[PDB]
Design a protein around this motif. Structure first.
Motif, mmCIF file in Angstrom:
data_model
loop_
_atom_site.group_PDB
_atom_site.id
_atom_site.type_symbol
_atom_site.label_atom_id
_atom_site.label_comp_id
_atom_site.label_asym_id
_atom_site.label_seq_id
_atom_site.Cartn_x
_atom_site.Cartn_y
_atom_site.Cartn_z
ATOM 1 N N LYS A 22 0.809 -1.207 0.000
ATOM 2 C CA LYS A 22 0.000 0.000 0.000
ATOM 3 C C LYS A 22 0.846 1.262 0.000
ATOM 4 N N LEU A 67 3.998 2.287 -1.313
ATOM 5 C CA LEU A 67 4.453 2.872 -2.564
ATOM 6 C C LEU A 67 3.283 3.146 -3.496
ATOM 7 N N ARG A 68 2.179 2.415 -3.319
ATOM 8 C CA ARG A 68 0.949 2.752 -4.022
ATOM 9 C C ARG A 68 0.424 4.105 -3.579
ATOM 10 N N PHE A 95 2.953 6.191 -5.333
ATOM 11 C CA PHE A 95 2.649 6.224 -6.752
ATOM 12 C C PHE A 95 1.220 5.758 -6.968
#
Lengths: 315, 253
Positions: A246, A248-249, A252
């Motif tokens: 979650k 790096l989501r 990004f």
């Protein structure tokens, strides 16, 4: 000096916080947190809006209303204690400049819509849009393209002030190369992006960017195109877990240009996601360890979940 | 292929040399009948072993018996062809060259009589073997390749394309050069289809842009979009990935 965005607001307008007498905007709440709970549901319950300090979380009959907002209402809150299926306090801080996929009035509506017109003191009002959403892309021409926003009504103050301070301005082997440049689209709408003033003026500019009432979001377009070199990254079978998937989501969810600062609890995948950011991003990265204590550690899981080691190690 | 063909060049000559009048006067009775009234010798399964029509949308092969009157003379025409064709091959292996009607023009410098013996060859390839009726077909198969080729080069080349591909494709060296004659007008492959037919229906479960029927370069009265409902809950799950964590790069950039 030159380091002053909007500090946390509430400092005054309150005297002996037992407002058994006044609670005037809470009386607006306490009208509808009390007029509404009659037939087995509350349809009320304003998160107990308190003017000074912070406000609370209901979280005891959240059902769908505040259990969806067990998370989502907490954007500018921080939920500093944790509890059982009861109330839950928080604090309040700088966390609207993080919440920049939304307007300060848009939350203010739902701040009212949660509160069943449990009306603000105004304390938050005079601190809602102090910093309008504004990004700083670092586009392909080596420094930055002077991105503004999806929304136009901000250059109108800006370009009437900023340039009068400081201006801005084989076949199949190459067919796909422009198909990538074909994908360089409108940046979700209109972009309104201007040209680099010679790379040595942004420091002179940033100090005046915030000077009116805006604030800037430095980005990192280092993934689609990059003019300097790329190191060899390699993620050798480093299976990881959805706490940091979650993460790096959140770093990004947009395109390839947005920086990031993420809090973990202790002992969590600290030397993982940065090593994940070391390799996925395709940069030439840097760690700033606290002591050499950190330095031996953080390379070691980097030596584990990266095979980037052929004296390719810089401690 | 060509060198094997070069080997059965004089191999077939030995069949010519051993046959003095037995199959030869068989030709002489009917090669006169080729001059008198034109009719193919066989209506049975021989045509299956035969190029029925390399270039179909033509009018007729009217003046058969081209600039070639005898068989070794016709055989010399391929000696005039193949040996020049390797001369049109072996030096050309340094540069890929895409010149479809320019080749046959420069060939006309090299080939003495052209554009009729280019087109009237593959039957006279076959028919001078038909008076033989000897050679096994797999033996004769790389030859039928060749008289097919200049026949195709004879007729339809200005709309079509010659490509010469000597370099590295499964040959790390130049150990097998090749060229190709492609056509380009699949229209002109399907125009005779359409003229022979009434009005005939394509159905393609993949064809989403209807604009590619004018890649077939044709006309269409009926071209719509079939819409079906799904009370089967949900037909499928189409799932565009685009990972953010492992950072999608799935096109070969």
């Amino acid at each position: 000096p030159g380091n002053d965005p909007q500090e946390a607001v509430p400092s005054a307008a309150g005297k002996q916080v037992d407002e058994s007498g006044t609670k005037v905007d809470e009386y607006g709440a306490k009208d509808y947190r009390l007029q509404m709970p009659l037939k087995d549901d509350h349809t009320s319950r304003p998160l107990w809006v308190a003017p000074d300090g912070h406000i609370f979380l209901e979280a005891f009959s959240p059902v769908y209303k505040y259990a969806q907002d067990f998370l989502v209402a907490i954007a500018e809150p921080v939920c500093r204690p944790t509890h059982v299926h009861e109330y839950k306090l928080t604090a309040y801080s700088l966390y609207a400049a993080v919440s920049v996929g939304l307007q300060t009035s848009d939350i203010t509506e739902y701040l009212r819509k949660l509160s069943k017109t449990g009306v603000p003191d105004g304390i938050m009002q005079f601190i809602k849009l102090c910093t309008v959403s504004y990004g700083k892309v670092k586009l392909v021409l080596k420094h930055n393209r002077y991105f503004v926003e999806s929304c136009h009504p901000d250059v109108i103050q800006h370009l009437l002030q900023d340039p009068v301070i400081r201006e801005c301005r084989m076949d199949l082997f190459d067919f796909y190369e422009q198909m990538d440049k074909d994908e360089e689209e409108e940046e979700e709408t209109q972009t309104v992006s201007f040209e680099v003033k010679q790379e040595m003026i942004e420091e002179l500019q940033k100090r005046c960017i915030h000077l009116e009432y805006p604030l800037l979001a430095e980005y990192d377009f280092r993934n689609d195109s990059v003019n300097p070199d790329i190191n060899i990254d390699l993620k050798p079978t480093a299976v990881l877990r959805p706490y940091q998937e979650k993460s790096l989501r959140k770093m990004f969810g947009n395109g390839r240009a947005r920086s990031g600062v993420i809090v973990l609890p202790c002992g969590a995948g600290k030397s993982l996601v940065g090593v994940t950011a070391a390799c996925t991003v395709r940069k030439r990265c840097l760690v700033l360890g606290n002591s050499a204590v950190s330095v031996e550690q953080w390379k070691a899981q980097f030596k584990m979940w990266s095979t980037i080691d052929d004296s390719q190690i810089c401690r | 292929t060509l060198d094997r063909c070069q080997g059965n060049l004089e191999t077939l000559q030995k069949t010519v040399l051993r046959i003095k009048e037995t199959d030869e006067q068989r030709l002489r009775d009917e090669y006169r009948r080729l001059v008198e009234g034109l009719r193919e010798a066989s209506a049975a399964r021989e045509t299956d072993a035969h190029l029925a029509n390399p270039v179909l949308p033509d009018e007729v092969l009217q003046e058969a018996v081209p600039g070639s009157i005898r068989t070794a003379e016709h055989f010399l025409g391929f000696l005039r062809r193949l040996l020049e064709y390797v001369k049109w091959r072996l030096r050309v292996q340094h540069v890929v060259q895409e010149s479809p009607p320019a080749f046959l023009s420069g060939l006309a410098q090299r080939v003495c009589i052209q554009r009729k013996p280019l087109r009237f060859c593959a039957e006279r390839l076959r028919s001078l073997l038909h008076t033989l009726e000897i050679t096994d077909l797999a033996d004769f198969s790389p030859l039928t390749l060749l008289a097919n080729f200049a026949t195709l080069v004879s007729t339809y080349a200005k709309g079509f394309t010659i490509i010469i591909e000597p370099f590295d494709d499964r040959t790390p060296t130049i150990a097998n050069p090749i060229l190709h004659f492609s056509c380009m007008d699949a229209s002109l492959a399907i125009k005779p289809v359409f003229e022979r037919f009434q009005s005939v229906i394509i159905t393609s479960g993949t064809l989403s842009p209807l604009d590619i029927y004018p890649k077939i370069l044709d006309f269409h009265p009926v071209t719509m979009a079939t819409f079906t409902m799904t009370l089967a809950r949900v037909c499928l799950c189409p799932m565009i990935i685009g990972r953010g964590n492992d950072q999608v790069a799935i096109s070969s950039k």
